[PDB]
Enzyme design. Structure first.
Site, PDB file in Angstrom:
ATOM      1  N   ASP A 139      -2.344 -14.545   5.345  1.00 41.31           N
ATOM      2  CA  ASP A 139      -1.144 -13.999   4.699  1.00 41.31           C
ATOM      3  C   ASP A 139      -0.408 -13.123   5.701  1.00 41.31           C
ATOM      4  OD1 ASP A 139       0.283 -12.756   2.473  1.00 41.31           O
ATOM      5  OD2 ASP A 139      -1.311 -11.463   2.045  1.00 41.31           O
ATOM      6  N   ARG A 143       5.429  -6.996   5.293  1.00 38.32           N
ATOM      7  CA  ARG A 143       4.624  -6.076   4.535  1.00 38.32           C
ATOM      8  C   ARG A 143       3.196  -5.645   5.264  1.00 38.32           C
ATOM      9  NH1 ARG A 143       5.037 -10.601   1.776  1.00 38.32           N
ATOM     10  NH2 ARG A 143       3.029 -12.003   1.463  1.00 38.32           N
ATOM     11  N   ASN A 144       2.396  -6.736   5.624  1.00 37.52           N
ATOM     12  CA  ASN A 144       1.152  -6.626   6.190  1.00 37.52           C
ATOM     13  C   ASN A 144       0.976  -6.331   7.753  1.00 37.52           C
ATOM     14  OD1 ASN A 144      -0.113  -6.972   3.575  1.00 37.52           O
ATOM     15  ND2 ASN A 144       0.030  -9.253   4.006  1.00 37.52           N
ATOM     16  N   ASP A 157      -5.012  -6.337   6.382  1.00 38.65           N
ATOM     17  CA  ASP A 157      -5.480  -7.354   5.296  1.00 38.65           C
ATOM     18  C   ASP A 157      -6.050  -8.795   6.088  1.00 38.65           C
ATOM     19  OD1 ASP A 157      -5.311  -5.469   3.496  1.00 38.65           O
ATOM     20  OD2 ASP A 157      -4.181  -6.916   2.011  1.00 38.65           O
TER      21      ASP A 157
HETATM   22  C1  LIG Z   1       5.047  -2.238   3.067  1.00 36.27           C
HETATM   23  C2  LIG Z   1       4.484  -1.208   2.041  1.00 36.27           C
HETATM   24  C3  LIG Z   1       3.373   0.012   2.884  1.00 36.27           C
HETATM   25  O1  LIG Z   1       2.458  -0.491   3.387  1.00 36.27           O
HETATM   26  N1  LIG Z   1       3.829   1.450   2.875  1.00 36.27           N
HETATM   27  C4  LIG Z   1       3.323   2.408   3.469  1.00 36.27           C
HETATM   28  C5  LIG Z   1       1.920   2.427   3.991  1.00 36.27           C
HETATM   29  C6  LIG Z   1       1.234   3.406   4.424  1.00 36.27           C
HETATM   30  N2  LIG Z   1      -0.110   3.538   5.080  1.00 36.27           N
HETATM   31  C7  LIG Z   1      -1.134   2.521   5.105  1.00 36.27           C
HETATM   32  N3  LIG Z   1      -2.079   2.484   5.820  1.00 36.27           N
HETATM   33  C8  LIG Z   1      -2.944   1.589   5.822  1.00 36.27           C
HETATM   34  C9  LIG Z   1      -2.917   0.560   5.172  1.00 36.27           C
HETATM   35  C10 LIG Z   1      -1.781   0.596   4.033  1.00 36.27           C
HETATM   36  C11 LIG Z   1      -1.725  -0.566   3.203  1.00 36.27           C
HETATM   37  C12 LIG Z   1      -2.606  -1.767   3.029  1.00 36.27           C
HETATM   38  N4  LIG Z   1      -2.073  -2.479   2.205  1.00 36.27           N
HETATM   39  C13 LIG Z   1      -2.771  -3.854   1.693  1.00 36.27           C
HETATM   40  C14 LIG Z   1      -1.170  -1.804   1.283  1.00 36.27           C
HETATM   41  C15 LIG Z   1      -0.444  -2.166   0.169  1.00 36.27           C
HETATM   42  C16 LIG Z   1       0.505  -1.570  -0.109  1.00 36.27           C
HETATM   43  C17 LIG Z   1       0.633  -0.219   0.418  1.00 36.27           C
HETATM   44  C18 LIG Z   1       0.130   0.096   1.694  1.00 36.27           C
HETATM   45  C19 LIG Z   1      -0.986  -0.329   2.101  1.00 36.27           C
HETATM   46  N5  LIG Z   1      -1.017   1.450   4.105  1.00 36.27           N
HETATM   47  C20 LIG Z   1       1.736   4.832   4.375  1.00 36.27           C
HETATM   48  O2  LIG Z   1       0.981   5.698   4.762  1.00 36.27           O
HETATM   49  C21 LIG Z   1       1.982   6.697   4.906  1.00 36.27           C
HETATM   50  C22 LIG Z   1       2.962   4.825   3.672  1.00 36.27           C
HETATM   51  C23 LIG Z   1       3.861   3.650   2.953  1.00 36.27           C
HETATM   52  N6  LIG Z   1       4.934   3.797   2.707  1.00 36.27           N
HETATM   53  C24 LIG Z   1       6.092   3.108   3.162  1.00 36.27           C
HETATM   54  C25 LIG Z   1       5.288   4.765   1.649  1.00 36.27           C
HETATM   55  C26 LIG Z   1       5.226   4.154   0.225  1.00 36.27           C
HETATM   56  N7  LIG Z   1       6.498   3.474   0.127  1.00 36.27           N
HETATM   57  C27 LIG Z   1       6.080   1.699  -0.234  1.00 36.27           C
HETATM   58  C28 LIG Z   1       7.029   3.912  -1.046  1.00 36.27           C
END
Ligand SMILES: */C=C\C(=O)Nc1cc(Nc2nccc(-c3cn(C)c4ccccc34)n2)c(OC)cc1N(C)CCN(C)C
Ligand SMILES: [Cl-]
Length: 283
Positions: A139, A143-144, A157
């Site tokens: 995957d 986004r990941n 992931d």
């Molecule tokens: C691409 C979207 C995203 O990840 N946005 C995001 C992520 C984080 N921090 C973070 N840290 C560790 C792991 C993750 C994570 C893992 N997976 C599978 C996720 C799915 C969806 C969202 C996050 C995931 N994320 C973060 O910390 C400050 C902020 C952030 N954003 C961009 C703020 C939310 N917007 C999408 C509105």
């Protein structure tokens, strides 16, 4: 090997708290969070992934998780902790800047060639580490990929596909078709070289500052499109040297695609003279 090794922790619910939602899905929900190790005074920003909910399954889940915690590279996220108390919850380190996909969209005006090329290098190094471990991600996408700092990104992931296995609902009920290699789409064949296809898509997402791939085309149409020989367009900032690399990742013959080792060398070379390979205004 060294005596000390990374070890998965089994966590208690008391240990960590959910503060806010970061993302949502059919899988579950990911939360911004705090972890405090038991009998310790330190508070650790975490991300907590809670699956929609097993007990028999718990043993199977644990085996998958152990691998996810063994991953030891600067560019791959390491699974810190798991909690099985009611539903599966997965604890990782919080990446403050969020994912690259949202990052390049927000900062499209202000991102220089060196940064983009550097991210390409770091993603390839992480993927290469997995390949040495003989681990297939399945995957890879923008986004990941997550941003610890502008100078540090990490692939997240890894191994989640198997976990979502423990399940039947999962099968009786999806895959990221737009990012997938043709073999994966037709026969569900997953290899390091189908990861290389997704790497190429991931680079395309960065080089276009977050464009959705194959936006007009619907997902069902995509297989037909690939056989026909269509591919994502050359991004405007990209020089042909860069695009040909992307094109190689998307070749029908798997062995023909570049290896991750090669991608590191190639993008490392480009990173050294960034303006040569990417034409950005204000660079
Ligand atoms: C691409 C979207 C995203 O990840 N946005 C995001 C992520 C984080 N921090 C973070 N840290 C560790 C792991 C993750 C994570 C893992 N997976 C599978 C996720 C799915 C969806 C969202 C996050 C995931 N994320 C973060 O910390 C400050 C902020 C952030 N954003 C961009 C703020 C939310 N917007 C999408 C509105
Ligand atoms: Cl999107």
């Amino acid at each position: 090997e060294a005596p000390n090794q990374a070890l998965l922790r089994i966590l208690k619910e008391t240990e960590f708290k959910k503060i806010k939602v970061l993302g949502s899905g059919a899988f579950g929900t990911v939360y911004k969070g705090l972890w405090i190790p038991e009998g310790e005074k330190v508070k650790i920003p975490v991300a907590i992934k809670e699956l929609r909910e097993s007990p028999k399954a718990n043993k199977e889940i644990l085996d998958e998780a152990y691998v996810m915690a063994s991953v030891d590279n600067p560019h791959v996220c390491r699974l810190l902790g798991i909690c099985l108390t009611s539903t599966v919850q997965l604890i990782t380190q919080l990446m403050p800047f969020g994912c690259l996909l949202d990052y390049v969209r927000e900062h499209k005006d202000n991102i220089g060639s060196q940064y983009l090329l550097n991210w390409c290098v770091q993603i390839a190094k992480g993927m290469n580490y997995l390949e040495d471990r003989r681990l297939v991600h399945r995957d890879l996408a923008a986004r990941n990929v997550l941003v610890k700092t502008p100078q540090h990104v990490k692939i997240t992931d890894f191994g989640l596909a198997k976990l979502l296995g423990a399940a039947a609902e999962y099968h009786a009920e999806k895959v990221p078709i737009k990012w997938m290699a043709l073999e994966s789409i037709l026969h569900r064949i997953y290899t390091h070289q189908s990861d290389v296809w997704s790497y190429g898509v991931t680079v395309w997402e960065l080089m276009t500052f977050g464009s959705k791939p194959y936006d007009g085309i619907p997902a069902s149409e995509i297989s037909s499109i690939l056989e026909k020989g269509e591919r994502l367009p050359q991004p405007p900032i990209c020089t042909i040297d860069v695009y040909m690399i992307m094109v190689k990742c998307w070749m029908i013959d798997a062995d023909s695609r570049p290896k991750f080792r090669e991608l590191i060398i190639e993008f490392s070379k480009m990173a050294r003279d960034p303006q040569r390979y990417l034409v950005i205004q204000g660079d």
